[PDB]
Amino acid sequence: SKGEELFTGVVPILVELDGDVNGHKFSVSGEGEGDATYGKLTLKFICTTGKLPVPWPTLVTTLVQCFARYPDHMKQHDFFKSAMPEGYVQERTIFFKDDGNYKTRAEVKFEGDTLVNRIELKGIDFKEDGNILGHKLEYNAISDNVYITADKQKNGIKANFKIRHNIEDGSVQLADHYQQNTPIGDGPVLLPDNHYLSTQSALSKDPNEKRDHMVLLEFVTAAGI
Protein backbone atom coordinates (compact mmCIF):
# COMPACT_ATOMS: atom_id res chain seq x y z
CA SER A 1 0.00 0.00 0.00
CA LYS A 2 2.96 2.34 0.59
CA GLY A 3 4.33 1.07 -2.75
CA GLU A 4 0.88 0.81 -4.34
CA GLU A 5 0.22 4.56 -3.80
CA LEU A 6 3.15 5.38 -6.10
CA PHE A 7 1.11 3.90 -9.02
CA THR A 8 -2.31 5.62 -8.71
CA GLY A 9 -1.58 8.00 -11.65
CA VAL A 10 0.43 8.02 -14.89
CA VAL A 11 4.12 7.27 -14.23
CA PRO A 12 6.96 8.05 -16.68
CA ILE A 13 9.21 5.09 -17.56
CA LEU A 14 12.84 4.86 -18.67
CA VAL A 15 14.43 1.67 -19.98
CA GLU A 16 18.17 1.13 -20.64
CA LEU A 17 19.51 -2.18 -21.89
CA ASP A 18 23.10 -3.22 -22.61
CA GLY A 19 23.25 -6.46 -24.63
CA ASP A 20 25.72 -8.95 -26.09
CA VAL A 21 24.47 -11.90 -28.19
CA ASN A 22 27.13 -14.25 -29.60
CA GLY A 23 29.55 -11.30 -29.27
CA HIS A 24 27.31 -8.80 -31.13
CA LYS A 25 27.09 -5.87 -28.71
CA PHE A 26 24.19 -3.43 -28.66
CA SER A 27 22.30 -0.90 -26.60
CA VAL A 28 18.62 -0.02 -26.43
CA SER A 29 17.02 2.99 -24.78
CA GLY A 30 13.29 3.35 -24.15
CA GLU A 31 10.86 5.93 -22.83
CA GLY A 32 7.16 6.11 -22.19
CA GLU A 33 4.49 5.94 -19.52
CA GLY A 34 2.55 3.40 -17.48
CA ASP A 35 -0.93 3.59 -15.90
CA ALA A 36 -1.36 0.73 -13.46
CA THR A 37 -5.04 1.59 -12.91
CA TYR A 38 -5.69 0.22 -16.42
CA GLY A 39 -2.65 -2.09 -16.67
CA LYS A 40 -1.52 0.04 -19.60
CA LEU A 41 2.03 0.73 -20.92
CA THR A 42 3.06 2.81 -23.93
CA LEU A 43 6.73 2.81 -24.86
CA LYS A 44 9.13 3.59 -27.67
CA PHE A 45 12.52 1.89 -27.88
CA ILE A 46 15.52 2.81 -29.99
CA CYS A 47 18.66 0.84 -30.80
CA THR A 48 21.30 3.44 -29.96
CA THR A 49 24.26 1.53 -31.40
CA GLY A 50 22.80 1.09 -34.92
CA LYS A 51 21.07 -2.03 -36.27
CA LEU A 52 19.78 -4.45 -33.67
CA PRO A 53 21.46 -7.93 -34.17
CA VAL A 54 18.40 -9.87 -32.98
CA PRO A 55 14.68 -9.51 -33.72
CA TRP A 56 12.83 -6.85 -31.69
CA PRO A 57 10.14 -9.38 -30.63
CA THR A 58 12.72 -11.41 -28.76
CA LEU A 59 13.53 -8.40 -26.52
CA VAL A 60 9.93 -7.45 -25.60
CA THR A 61 9.71 -9.49 -22.42
CA THR A 62 13.09 -8.23 -21.25
CA LEU A 63 12.41 -4.57 -21.98
CA VAL A 64 8.03 -3.55 -15.69
CA GLN A 65 5.40 -5.85 -14.22
CA CYS A 66 4.80 -3.33 -11.41
CA PHE A 67 2.36 -1.77 -13.93
CA ALA A 68 0.04 -4.82 -13.86
CA ARG A 69 -3.57 -4.09 -12.95
CA TYR A 70 -4.32 -6.19 -9.88
CA PRO A 71 -8.09 -6.47 -9.27
CA ASP A 72 -9.14 -5.10 -5.90
CA HIS A 73 -9.75 -8.60 -4.51
CA MET A 74 -6.11 -9.63 -5.38
CA LYS A 75 -4.25 -6.54 -4.06
CA GLN A 76 -2.49 -8.48 -1.28
CA HIS A 77 -0.82 -10.57 -4.05
CA ASP A 78 1.07 -7.72 -5.84
CA PHE A 79 4.72 -8.32 -5.05
CA PHE A 80 5.97 -5.88 -7.63
CA LYS A 81 4.44 -2.68 -6.27
CA SER A 82 5.13 -3.72 -2.65
CA ALA A 83 8.89 -3.67 -3.41
CA MET A 84 8.75 0.00 -4.43
CA PRO A 85 10.21 2.54 -4.28
CA GLU A 86 13.51 0.76 -3.47
CA GLY A 87 12.72 -1.77 -6.20
CA TYR A 88 13.50 -5.31 -7.21
CA VAL A 89 15.98 -7.37 -9.20
CA GLN A 90 14.46 -9.38 -12.04
CA GLU A 91 16.51 -12.21 -13.50
CA ARG A 92 15.60 -14.50 -16.36
CA THR A 93 16.83 -17.29 -18.49
CA ILE A 94 15.10 -17.48 -21.83
CA PHE A 95 15.63 -20.73 -23.75
CA PHE A 96 14.97 -20.53 -27.48
CA LYS A 97 14.01 -24.00 -28.66
CA ASP A 98 16.68 -25.53 -30.89
CA ASP A 99 18.77 -22.35 -30.57
CA GLY A 100 20.57 -20.24 -27.95
CA ASN A 101 19.62 -18.61 -24.69
CA TYR A 102 19.38 -15.16 -23.12
CA LYS A 103 20.29 -14.50 -19.52
CA THR A 104 19.15 -11.18 -18.16
CA ARG A 105 19.55 -9.21 -14.99
CA ALA A 106 17.59 -6.05 -14.39
CA GLU A 107 17.04 -3.58 -11.57
CA VAL A 108 13.64 -1.89 -11.52
CA LYS A 109 13.30 1.06 -9.13
CA PHE A 110 12.15 4.66 -8.88
CA GLU A 111 14.54 7.52 -9.65
CA GLY A 112 12.51 10.44 -8.36
CA ASP A 113 9.13 10.26 -10.09
CA THR A 114 10.43 8.03 -12.89
CA LEU A 115 10.25 4.24 -12.93
CA VAL A 116 13.58 3.00 -14.30
CA ASN A 117 14.38 -0.45 -15.77
CA ARG A 118 18.15 -0.99 -16.12
CA ILE A 119 19.04 -4.25 -17.86
CA GLU A 120 22.07 -6.35 -18.85
CA LEU A 121 21.47 -9.12 -21.38
CA LYS A 122 23.85 -11.90 -22.37
CA GLY A 123 23.02 -14.32 -25.19
CA ILE A 124 25.05 -17.40 -26.12
CA ASP A 125 24.93 -20.55 -28.28
CA PHE A 126 22.85 -19.08 -31.07
CA LYS A 127 23.11 -20.40 -34.63
CA GLU A 128 24.38 -17.95 -37.30
CA ASP A 129 21.58 -19.02 -39.66
CA GLY A 130 18.91 -19.65 -36.97
CA ASN A 131 15.65 -17.80 -36.53
CA ILE A 132 17.19 -15.26 -34.15
CA LEU A 133 20.55 -14.23 -35.67
CA GLY A 134 18.99 -14.85 -39.12
CA HIS A 135 16.11 -12.42 -38.48
CA LYS A 136 13.36 -14.87 -39.47
CA LEU A 137 10.74 -13.87 -36.90
CA GLU A 138 7.62 -11.91 -37.82
CA TYR A 139 7.20 -8.45 -36.27
CA ASN A 140 4.15 -9.67 -34.45
CA ALA A 141 2.34 -9.07 -31.20
CA ILE A 142 2.98 -11.49 -28.37
CA SER A 143 0.39 -12.53 -25.79
CA ASP A 144 0.53 -15.09 -22.99
CA ASN A 145 0.11 -15.82 -19.31
CA VAL A 146 2.92 -15.30 -16.82
CA TYR A 147 2.55 -17.89 -14.01
CA ILE A 148 3.70 -16.50 -10.68
CA THR A 149 4.47 -18.35 -7.44
CA ALA A 150 6.07 -17.36 -4.13
CA ASP A 151 9.78 -17.98 -3.40
CA LYS A 152 9.98 -17.80 0.42
CA GLN A 153 13.72 -18.63 0.60
CA LYS A 154 14.75 -15.40 -1.19
CA ASN A 155 11.78 -13.29 -0.03
CA GLY A 156 10.54 -12.99 -3.61
CA ILE A 157 8.79 -14.70 -6.48
CA LYS A 158 9.42 -16.98 -9.45
CA ALA A 159 7.59 -17.10 -12.73
CA ASN A 160 7.50 -19.27 -15.83
CA PHE A 161 5.87 -18.84 -19.19
CA LYS A 162 6.26 -19.63 -22.89
CA ILE A 163 6.18 -17.26 -25.79
CA ARG A 164 5.52 -18.68 -29.25
CA HIS A 165 7.09 -16.33 -31.81
CA ASN A 166 5.73 -16.65 -35.36
CA ILE A 167 8.39 -17.50 -37.96
CA GLU A 168 8.20 -16.05 -41.51
CA ASP A 169 7.49 -19.54 -43.02
CA GLY A 170 4.33 -20.00 -40.83
CA SER A 171 6.01 -22.08 -38.13
CA VAL A 172 6.79 -21.09 -34.51
CA GLN A 173 9.91 -20.32 -32.47
CA LEU A 174 9.34 -21.24 -28.84
CA ALA A 175 10.99 -19.17 -26.09
CA ASP A 176 10.73 -20.74 -22.59
CA HIS A 177 11.05 -18.14 -19.83
CA TYR A 178 12.16 -18.74 -16.26
CA GLN A 179 12.06 -15.76 -13.95
CA GLN A 180 13.02 -14.79 -10.42
CA ASN A 181 12.42 -11.47 -8.66
CA THR A 182 13.91 -10.38 -5.32
CA PRO A 183 13.53 -7.08 -3.43
CA ILE A 184 16.38 -4.59 -3.30
CA GLY A 185 15.23 -3.05 0.02
CA ASP A 186 14.84 -4.86 3.36
CA GLY A 187 11.24 -3.76 4.06
CA PRO A 188 8.23 -6.10 4.01
CA VAL A 189 6.93 -7.26 0.65
CA LEU A 190 3.81 -9.17 -0.34
CA LEU A 191 4.45 -12.83 -1.12
CA PRO A 192 1.62 -14.02 -3.32
CA ASP A 193 -0.47 -17.13 -3.72
CA ASN A 194 -0.24 -18.68 -7.18
CA HIS A 195 -1.76 -16.53 -9.90
CA TYR A 196 -0.94 -15.24 -13.38
CA LEU A 197 -0.53 -12.04 -15.36
CA SER A 198 -2.45 -11.97 -18.61
CA THR A 199 -0.24 -9.87 -20.91
CA GLN A 200 -0.75 -8.61 -24.45
CA SER A 201 1.86 -6.57 -26.36
CA ALA A 202 1.19 -4.91 -29.74
CA LEU A 203 4.25 -3.94 -31.79
CA SER A 204 4.33 -1.09 -34.33
CA LYS A 205 6.62 1.41 -36.08
CA ASP A 206 6.82 5.24 -36.06
CA PRO A 207 6.61 6.23 -39.75
CA ASN A 208 8.90 9.28 -39.22
CA GLU A 209 11.58 7.39 -37.28
CA LYS A 210 14.68 6.40 -39.26
CA ARG A 211 16.59 4.76 -36.39
CA ASP A 212 16.04 1.01 -35.68
CA HIS A 213 13.13 1.10 -33.20
CA MET A 214 10.00 -0.48 -31.76
CA VAL A 215 6.77 1.10 -30.51
CA LEU A 216 4.87 -0.93 -27.91
CA LEU A 217 1.36 -0.79 -26.47
CA GLU A 218 0.94 -3.34 -23.66
CA PHE A 219 -1.92 -4.40 -21.36
CA VAL A 220 -1.21 -6.49 -18.29
CA THR A 221 -3.86 -7.83 -15.86
CA ALA A 222 -3.55 -10.13 -12.83
CA ALA A 223 -5.93 -13.11 -12.72
CA GLY A 224 -6.52 -16.65 -11.56
CA ILE A 225 -7.88 -16.04 -8.06
CATH number of the domain that 24 lies in?
2.40.155.10
Residues 117, 64 contacting (CB under 8 angstroms): yes
Resolution, rounded to a tenth of an Å? 1.8
∠ Cα 42 45 47 (to 5°):
175
Query: How many domains in the chain?
Result: 1
**Rounded-to-integer distance, Cα 25 and Cα 71, Å:** 40
Domain of residue 121 covers 1-225
How far CA 73 is from CA of 136, 183, 197, in Å, comes to: 42, 23, 15
